[PDB]
Subunit: 364 residues, 4 copies
Amino acid sequence: VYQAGTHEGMIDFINMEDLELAATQVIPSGGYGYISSGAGDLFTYRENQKAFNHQLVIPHVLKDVELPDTTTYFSDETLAAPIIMAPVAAHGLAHEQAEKASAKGVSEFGTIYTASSYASCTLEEIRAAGGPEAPQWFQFYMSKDDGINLDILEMAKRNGAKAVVLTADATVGGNRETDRRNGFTFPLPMPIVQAYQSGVGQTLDAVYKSSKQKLSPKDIEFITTHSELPVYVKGVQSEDDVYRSLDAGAQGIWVSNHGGRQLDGGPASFDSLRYVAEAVDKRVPIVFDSGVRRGQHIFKAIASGADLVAIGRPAIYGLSLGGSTGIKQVFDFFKTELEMVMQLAGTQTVEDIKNAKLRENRFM
Amino acid sequence: VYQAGTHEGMIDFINMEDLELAATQVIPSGGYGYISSGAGDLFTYRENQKAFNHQLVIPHVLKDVELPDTTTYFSDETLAAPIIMAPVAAHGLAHEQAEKASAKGVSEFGTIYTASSYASCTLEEIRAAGGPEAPQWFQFYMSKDDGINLDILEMAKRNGAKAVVLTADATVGGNRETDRRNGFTFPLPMPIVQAYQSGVGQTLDAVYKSSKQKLSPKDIEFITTHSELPVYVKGVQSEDDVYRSLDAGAQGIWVSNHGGRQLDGGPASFDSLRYVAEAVDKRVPIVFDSGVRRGQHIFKAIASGADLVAIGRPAIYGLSLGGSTGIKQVFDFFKTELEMVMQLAGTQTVEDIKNAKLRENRFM
Amino acid sequence: VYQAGTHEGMIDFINMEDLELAATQVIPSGGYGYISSGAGDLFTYRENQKAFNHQLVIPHVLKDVELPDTTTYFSDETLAAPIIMAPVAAHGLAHEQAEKASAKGVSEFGTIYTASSYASCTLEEIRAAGGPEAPQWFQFYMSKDDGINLDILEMAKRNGAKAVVLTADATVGGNRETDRRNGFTFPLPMPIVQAYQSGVGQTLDAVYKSSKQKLSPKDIEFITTHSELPVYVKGVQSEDDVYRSLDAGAQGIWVSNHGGRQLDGGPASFDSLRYVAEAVDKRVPIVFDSGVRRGQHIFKAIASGADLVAIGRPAIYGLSLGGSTGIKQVFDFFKTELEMVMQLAGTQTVEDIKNAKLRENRFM
Amino acid sequence: VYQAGTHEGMIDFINMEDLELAATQVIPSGGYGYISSGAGDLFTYRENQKAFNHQLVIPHVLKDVELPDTTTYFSDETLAAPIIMAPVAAHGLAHEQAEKASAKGVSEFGTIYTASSYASCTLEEIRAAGGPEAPQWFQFYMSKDDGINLDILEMAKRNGAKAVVLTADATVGGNRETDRRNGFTFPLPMPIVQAYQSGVGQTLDAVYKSSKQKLSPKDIEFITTHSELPVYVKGVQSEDDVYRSLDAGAQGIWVSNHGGRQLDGGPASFDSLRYVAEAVDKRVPIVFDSGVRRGQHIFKAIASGADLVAIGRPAIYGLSLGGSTGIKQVFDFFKTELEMVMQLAGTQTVEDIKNAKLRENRFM
Ligand SMILES: Cc1cc2c(cc1C)N(C[C@H](O)[C@H](O)[C@H](O)COP(=O)(O)O)c1[nH]c(=O)[nH]c(=O)c1N2
Ligand SMILES: Cc1cc2c(cc1C)N(C[C@H](O)[C@H](O)[C@H](O)COP(=O)(O)O)c1[nH]c(=O)[nH]c(=O)c1N2
Ligand SMILES: Cc1cc2c(cc1C)N(C[C@H](O)[C@H](O)[C@H](O)COP(=O)(O)O)c1[nH]c(=O)[nH]c(=O)c1N2
Ligand SMILES: Cc1cc2c(cc1C)N(C[C@H](O)[C@H](O)[C@H](O)COP(=O)(O)O)c1[nH]c(=O)[nH]c(=O)c1N2
């Protein structure tokens, strides 16, 4: 039987590196491999974290700043910080309480929770665990069947999703050789997608191949027609992808390379953010992820055109060790680091971060 | 007595790195040294594989792609994938069945087999092993004697060669210090070139020095006059070399640095491909090799102007461990990776790969 | 009880690297951690020392130079070399005689001593130890209370400070994870700031947070109004910061990133010096620090627009091992290396260093 | 008593790296330290060998080349190859037969021998050992005394020196910390400079400081007036140094950084060669050294504007292990590698090397 973390309470860590190492003591080796590794030779995965020092934050002086405020007004939401939970499959790999513990902790921190289509809990359980006022978005892995897609969108609406995130960069799985070496299969059901995917004993290759490969702009139009929720396209890393998305009626862009898990030999997401921000030209909101481990990474992404930054692996490691308490402590780590960076950079508010000018590193 | 691999059947590997390591268990150390190493301080050899991340593949989204097709129409041939067997000497160093096993396996995969002038089998055996419908090209190490050169061209014609590949970048051998340390000599005859080279007990320095050093455009004209087969010049890495080749009547260009085995301190072949593709301007087909270990490398070469990509060492390691079955499994590894890359890049067909735009890596 | 170094006399070292290692034998581990480490992942701290080879010194020939003279005329001062003591807190962490030993040694070398607001001695003791003719500057960590700030400025005047250095890049402490791992607290009082900070048993986070966070140009105007001493702004790394400082009446600019102790992910100070020197355009003097370990680093900073170069950690390591004798030996190491560099570069005097042209390193 | 190598005969090596290691078995540790190491943190010393791959040699094809000829016509000399012996002090540190063995071996190879002012033999012994037809140049470390300088120039003339090489980049010694750690002193006299320097028991700092520091263009004019031999200025790495040298009547330029032994933090000599070749514009001959370990390095230097390439440490390691036979084997190693590079690059003669175009490495 697969046994994940069970602790609910405060965890001891300094940074996200010793947290990642500590989680190896509570997550079974196959599950830890699935969470921790990446595609191919890991060039793109390693570049994600390195890329934040391609651009340098200037520690300005005499900026008349104290008690910097991370409070973020986004649509009709008031977030504690411009930091949100990325959609991550199967939280039962990390903690017995799974998405109930992660939705509760992210609700208590006070920010957006993005639910995965491949969750180990129902969306009804995720909504119940966060509470009725918790801001929640729905990440969509589409079926090949449009009847099933209508049913999943009506289900997202019933559960008060405020946006639909169409993940478009995992039409098939990457060459994840750690999962191959481990013979990884999912241990739990995937109730949200149960009409097309059973989860238990399935390879990640089989799971992604059960979803829709032939995604196109018509899929954005389908979601608009049948849900009337704003659509974010996730995995956007070029101008061409921005224009395809906006022309089809997308109301948000989510810059990502899937945490280096997909196409090895592609760019770091932070480098792609420059190209995407120029193409979007503030027409719609931008979410950014992949490689974020420090407050300075969040600051640099927002200065470079992101409106929100999403957290993946670090949140899952905190969940494994401390449940709702532990995942909230990870969000608090990022908020506390962002407050330090804001004071030393000279930015009183999140809007001031957007107006900061980074220096390109000519000696990387 | 020199004893190579003898197994015929399925081999267990994840990627080309663990395959290269596994082959050390079946190839005698001197033969393994000859296959695996490179010239001088190994700068050029190491740069070949690194250079593929000088250019970054964009994982596009909403591209309306599924079941990408690697089928390649080349002249009157239908290939399984745009992936061919490079000319590699003396397959008897790797497997007892030598070029019979490699020609059979490449025929069964369904692509072009390039026979080496320094083969351990006759071209008659290579044609018989592939079958009459197998696409085969003849790689020519020319004699100093034009009578011998006429005889070798008539022999290539009798065996249904569809092209002659004039290898022009090995007029002498490189400074291969692993072969020097090992006291390497060839253990088998070289029947195709037996009129000028006996093979058995000969150093690689002596073998290359027995062939023609003073290659010139007149040699292309000689091959056209006496065979009426299309001539590819192999080792082309600059505009000057393209113009010298085309002005002399070459009908193909093969971009290579001989797998880093020749002039240490020269460029990586993938970097040279940009210069050669601009000079050729689609006037003749381009074959590309040197350093290819992943589907993403094949995709990037084709996006950068290659029509076909040739495989060297990885195919020989598969041959050593599994014979015809093992070499076909290596071609299947590259085809399966290329299908994954095509889906995630958004390319339905091989012609779509040619139209993909890579992003230059400013932070290598 | 905290026990620091006690030796007064000559120390044995080759360079600043073996000196840093030797100091681990006499400084208690918590104090050594506080002195030696830096913020976050240590990118900025490591880049400081690497950055000196971003620009290359040309060893000119036939320059008609011998017995190069480091004598520096600065205001009405005559310095032995263009090399000064940086403000560093709590010298009692390094040596029992603390700032008495460091002020005496720097006075005997014959250069400017910058006293820290967080000193373990009174400014009266620092003035008494240096003697009445010793050039001393006062580094100011301001109170939130303007009455306390007036008292501290009157105290600096009574002790013959010739400049006030407003440190503006430590409004809060950086994420110094070595100090967190060690549970570091200060062992000694901070008498200069005793009206707002007690020092003993306090975290570095608490100490910086007791000083003023909301520094602005109004603070420069306050210091001018109440002391009539020239004001240097310390931590300046951009054109915007130069203009804010000069517009508010600053009479000096001190280029620094606080030895990599503050905002990780920011630039190396030597790289920032180019931007600051262009903005200042010789309107006021420039002091430079962060990463200086060799005479060639001092030469390059002066050629790039610095008038004076400040020494931090290396001086503290020398103090720990040899007291006044040991700190003077560190200044002598830098002067002797600078004389070697001046001879080989072809610069007779310090003004000749300013006119030297470095070559940018295109292959870093 | 200092005991150096004594063997006269053939030595076993593959490349200059295993030769450098083998010499540790026959050269006493202090002498080996003096020969092998460099200044400061060894940035410049390490960059010298790395810098050859800043520019890439194109292996051209169909160039109509065989049996490439390294024969070099230089003034009225006929050299075996465009490869000469650099001036290196005190060959008695390496072999008992000292400069007698090195002059004989370089004469038998058939190239220019540059005698050091700090030789362990007289120039009469060096001339006698090479024979009357051996091309020999005299490297001059000048006295502060012009009477002594006239005597040394008349001595060079009597011994048939064909050029005077004024070494201008060692007016003082670099910070050679291996020699400091070892307490190195010279074990033998320096007869050529005996009027001002005794050699025995002297530090390298004392030896360089006994020679002239205040070198200027007047020193070139002095040498022309009193010897009527062509003057080469050694250590030239910039346009300013070329113009100072030529304006003062220099008839040759020797590009060098003294093998990384002098000013750490300066450029690699191969990178400086581009700047110097553009300034010289073929007005006088150029000699190049520092970091040469491969035939490809010699080829690249000549393609980049050198007329001759000088060898230092590798020749001394060969001398230590095999005397005259061993030093000739090192010159033969470089000639044999240069012949391989010429064949693969497509250059029939040394003048053809000068016309080769390298590709700048954009991904170093
Ligand atoms: C274990 C695991 C599982 C998933 C993911 C990631 C990881 C680590 N990601 C990608 C995710 O949304 C995000 O892009 C990355 O996690 C960001 O990189 P970092 O983990 O922060 O480095 C992902 N994305 C998505 O849209 N749906 C999913 O179900 C999952 N599943
Ligand atoms: C053992 C071995 C032997 C040979 C070669 C290579 C190797 C590894 N190569 C070069 C070959 O065609 C090709 O250019 C490289 O193998 C490509 O680099 P990779 O091996 O794929 O990295 C080669 N080329 C050629 O034209 N004729 C030959 O006989 C040989 N022999
Ligand atoms: C232990 C310690 C303590 C302090 C400092 C540094 C160090 C190492 N620094 C920063 C200092 O003035 C200077 O900018 C750096 O020391 C320069 O970098 P290097 O130490 O030379 O590499 C510092 N700066 C300041 O203005 N007031 C202070 O009290 C201190 N305290
Ligand atoms: C042991 C030793 C001793 C000397 C030198 C070098 C070495 C290694 N060099 C510098 C020499 O001429 C040359 O510039 C370098 O040796 C070139 O670098 P490589 O040794 O080839 O890497 C040197 N140069 C010079 O003009 N007169 C000298 O007496 C000496 N002495």
